[PDB]
Amino acid sequence: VTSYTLSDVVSLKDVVPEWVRIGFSATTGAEYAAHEVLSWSFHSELSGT
Amino acid sequence: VTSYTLSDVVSLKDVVPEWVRIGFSATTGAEYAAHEVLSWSFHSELS
Amino acid sequence: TETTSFLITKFSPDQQNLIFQGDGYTTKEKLTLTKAVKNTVGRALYSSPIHIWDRETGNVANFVTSFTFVINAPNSYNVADGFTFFIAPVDTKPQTGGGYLGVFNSAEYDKTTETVAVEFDTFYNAAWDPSNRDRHIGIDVNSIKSVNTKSWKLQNGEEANVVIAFNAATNVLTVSLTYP
Amino acid sequence: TETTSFLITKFSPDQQNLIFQGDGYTTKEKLTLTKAVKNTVGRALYSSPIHIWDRETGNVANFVTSFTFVINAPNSYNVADGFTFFIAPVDTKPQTGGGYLGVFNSAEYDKTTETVAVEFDTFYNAAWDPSNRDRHIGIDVNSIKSVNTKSWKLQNGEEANVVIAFNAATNVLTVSLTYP
């Protein structure tokens, strides 16, 4: 059980739009590997204050 | 507080496709009214 | 195992997770399907496809939805046509208007349509609607002629709180409407 | 209040609530973004747009996502380019490949991209990657030069379980990866 953790401040409001799409990307170039996803879950919530 | 209830067996597996869209519709013809929804929530789970 | 869920407690002018058809549109606060005008249709769909059942397992989903709606007729005696919550194919487009609520095209069972709808019908159509001529709740499977109905007294201008639930083990669909 | 949620524990051959781009495809049980082939791009998006902030209230969403991914390189020491979870405009399409991970175009901050990404970078690109030459986790904001990174030792063929989360009150994005 090897665990890594990174954390920072991203002010979403100033970078992305109100409505977004989220997802995954993977690429190869001169070197390569297969990239695979097995499970995914997402939950978000926004207030109307 | 006034309420109404209805229940019936529906064999969804023999009527709709595996992947569906859900939603609302409303119509008027020779007669009419405004039809509006104020809030909506949904939850489904397949195993 | 697959879950889909969402909650919208107030609709916005830019409700981009919905798909509008016909005259359906969102405003500040409300989702408007039809204004009070003649021969009109409005539909609004959640943008994401739902996996309601599965081939390899034969598994079927359990789901529940809840919504508040308001019908507003300028003449409380001439009220038509009604409202539905439906489950249809991914490529679903509006069907016949007026008495067919924008989801069915006939009163004979039609396997093609692949739509189950829960209707809140305000207008008696002699050809398929209940003999008592009452406004009613109904469960529709591939036909505008409901498999089951219950008389409902329309409270004009009032908010109706609906909860529709489907239990996969029993295949029972339950509808409940409550006024304050 | 607006909520969007979903759970996919095992992928189906027809997975209609995702949008595929490049060579992205699903099969029974997994989503394959790229096969082990040179010069390729795979992307997979969730169908519905997500409301992540509101200009009118000024509010921002709290969100949490988690996924299990496998990287499988046939030459275990020559591995490239990586994988990212990203957040971008609704109309997002594949950007530059190779070291740009299909999500960016530049190693300079570009206000036009409107994309935040969390990268699991497996190939050292001298023009912008950590001088320590280690494979790394990183937080990218409109640039392929990450704002912050962490060295990570890849386990080939092993399941990483990742959780990413964003706190609306503090604006901190937390990333954790775990191998068994």
Ligand SMILES: OC[C@H]1O[C@H](O)[C@@H](O)[C@@H](O)[C@@H]1O
């Ligand atoms: O695949 C490794 C490497 O291959 C090439 O040198 C380029 O396409 C780079 O962008 C990429 O990072």
Ligand SMILES: OC[C@H]1O[C@H](O)[C@@H](O)[C@@H](O)[C@@H]1O
């Ligand atoms: O609007 C009430 C009624 O008007 C006409 O008679 C037709 O459009 C019907 O289908 C509809 O039900």
Ligand SMILES: [Ca+2]
């Ligand atoms: Ca009718």
Ligand SMILES: [Ca+2]
């Ligand atoms: Ca790199």
Ligand SMILES: [Mn+2]
């Ligand atoms: Mn009827």
Ligand SMILES: [Mn+2]
């Ligand atoms: Mn990097």
